[PDB]
Design a protein around this nucleic acid. Structure first.
Ligand SMILES: Cc1cc2nc3c(=O)[nH]c(=O)nc-3n(C[C@H](O)[C@H](O)[C@H](O)COP(=O)(O)OP(=O)(O)OC[C@H]3O[C@@H](n4cnc5c(N)ncnc54)[C@H](O)[C@@H]3O)c2cc1C
Length: 456
DNA sequence: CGGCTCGCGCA
DNA sequence: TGCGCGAAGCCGAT
């Protein structure tokens, strides 16, 4: 609907109806940014055609109680900066608290909304909120994929078994969907405190804070400055200083050669399409560029495909049949070690390498990409059952990772424990044919002692 | 039938 | 360190 630089395949209608006379309402959930936001740009285009203002609404749910302070402050501080950024474009921002199914329905009626637009997320709870809103409103409802370069329903129509079958499909659609972002035109017609929401939330999460023996907090918040502006700086420094050596040193946890974009990419503080555009134009190592593009395009967006077409993405049923049969047969195998959630959480295992991986997660909130596999696969080896291992890994991932509660997390954990998007390997006790990682294998690929000594 | 995002022996 | 082989089931081009 209207616009020359807007691909209609990025927008899909969730509910048809007569368009109202009021402003266009953008229900911002996943892409918390002002620039490079297709959902915000599309909302502005519909508003321009209808000669109505565009507004953004945010619903603060009770889900932050399941998380900790580290995600709350990171997310809330970025929204404060986003509030100023949208204010400069004469776009008002309304921050609501409560159930989005009931709050969004009330906001549309009270504000006399004409059209409702929201971003795309394949998570279960997002689909539940959308259906609740659909039953309570009478205006057109649209959904825009502002997170993936190629829209999730357009890249593939089915669950993808592996990357090698999804890679040609994604790369074929890149020329159509990889394009520059038009600038966000400000509003022409003009028409809760975030500080109070922040101060209340930390008070409710203070008891659940991760502490040391001397009651000192474990989380170090100076490693990643949140916000749209800081996310851009991280991207620029990656291309200039780190992209060249990414291809060779991405699997070395002792070297800070990763992009460190996942906390911003999870909260939508930066667009992966913007990152792809800058990386494509960069003159760097061709092997490094191909390796990084495979990470942010194929593996990031296949995680959306996994969650979109598998409602049980965080369960044992989502595993492939070969993986399920292999794990089932080894249920009665005697485990070399039985560890509980608390012992995993405190880093109280016999493995100093695994403990150091947990400490990096506890202290920085972002464990290195390579050690994340060894972290999750040892949980399977040292748990009562595959279901318990899946529960433990998801719990610690979602509680302590800044990029937690993300499709990349569920696909990554399902890859590690259930062989999702993987293949079978040598038969072993307990883990069966799931891919095996050993402490000695990590020794021959990076300096394990340096990584251990860094995080005690 | 070819080829998939580990460990391991060997220079 | 970097390279080639081994051990496993299966998708997808035909
Ligand atoms: C068990 C396990 C759990 C995971 N949990 C999370 C999580 O909670 N949140 C999360 O965002 N990612 C998760 N991943 C994926 C991966 O660990 C992170 O994306 C990455 O380590 C974050 O660091 P980075 O952005 O600097 O990595 P980079 O090497 O710089 O990667 C760049 C971007 O590519 C994407 N990406 C890279 N590797 C993967 C991957 N394996 N799967 C999917 N996308 C990928 C991410 O968007 C990332 O920001 C997990 C991986 C594993 C093995």
């Amino acid at each position: 609907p209207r616009g020359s630089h807007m691909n209609p395949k990025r927008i899909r209608a969730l509910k048809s109806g007569k368009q109202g006379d009021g402003p266009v309402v953008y229900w911002m959930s996943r892409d918390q940014r002002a620039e490079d936001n297709w959902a915000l740009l599309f909302s502005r285009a519909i508003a321009k055609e209808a000669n109505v203002p565009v507004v953004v609404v945010f619903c603060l749910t009770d889900e932050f109680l399941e998380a900790g302070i580290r995600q709350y402050e990171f997310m809330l501080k970025g929204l404060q900066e986003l509030e100023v950024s949208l204010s400069r474009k004469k776009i008002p921002s309304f921050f609501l608290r409560g159930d989005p199914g009931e709050k969004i329905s009330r906001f549309v009626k009270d504000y006399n909304a004409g059209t409702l637009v929201t971003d795309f997320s394949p998570l279960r709870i997002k689909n539940q909120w959308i259906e609740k809103v659909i039953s309570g409103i009478s205006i057109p409802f649209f959904e825009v994929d502002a997170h993936n370069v190629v829209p999730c329903w357009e890249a593939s129509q089915k669950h993808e078994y592996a990357a090698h079958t999804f890679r040609p499909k994604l790369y074929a659609l890149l020329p159509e969907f990889l394009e520059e972002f038009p600038e966000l035109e400000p509003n022409s017609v003009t028409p809760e405190t975030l500080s109070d929401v922040l101060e209340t939330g930390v008070k409710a999460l203070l008891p659940e804070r991760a502490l040391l023996k001397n009651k000192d907090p474990l989380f170090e918040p100076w490693h990643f400055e949140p916000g749209e502006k800081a996310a851009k700086k991280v991207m620029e420094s990656f291309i200039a200083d780190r992209l060249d050596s990414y291809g060779a040193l991405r699997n070395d946890p002792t070297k800070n050669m990763l992009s460190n974009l996942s906390p911003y990419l999870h909260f939508g503080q930066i667009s992966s399409q913007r990152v792809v555009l800058e990386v494509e134009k960069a003159e760097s190592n061709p092997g490094s560029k191909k390796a990084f593009l495979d990470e942010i395009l194929i593996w990031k967006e296949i995680s959306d495909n996994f969650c979109y077409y598998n409602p049980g993405y965080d369960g044992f049923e989502s595993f492939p049949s070969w993986a399920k049969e292999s794990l089932n047969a080894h249920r009665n195998d005697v485990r070399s070690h039985i560890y509980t959630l608390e012992e995993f959480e405190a880093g109280k295992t016999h493995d100093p390498l695994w403990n150091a991986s947990q400490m990096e997660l506890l202290s920085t909130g972002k464990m290195h990409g390579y050690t994340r596999m060894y972290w999750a696969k040892k949980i399977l080896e040292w748990s009562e059952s595959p279901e318990k291992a899946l529960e433990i890994a998801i719990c610690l991932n979602d509680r302590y990772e800044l990029d937690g509660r993300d499709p990349n997390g569920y696909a990554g954990i399902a890859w590690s424990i259930g062989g999702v998007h993987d293949r079978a390997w040598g038969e072993r006790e307990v883990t069966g044919k799931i891919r095996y990682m050993s402490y000695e294998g990590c020794k021959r690929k990076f300096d394990v002692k340096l990584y251990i000594e860094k995080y005690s």
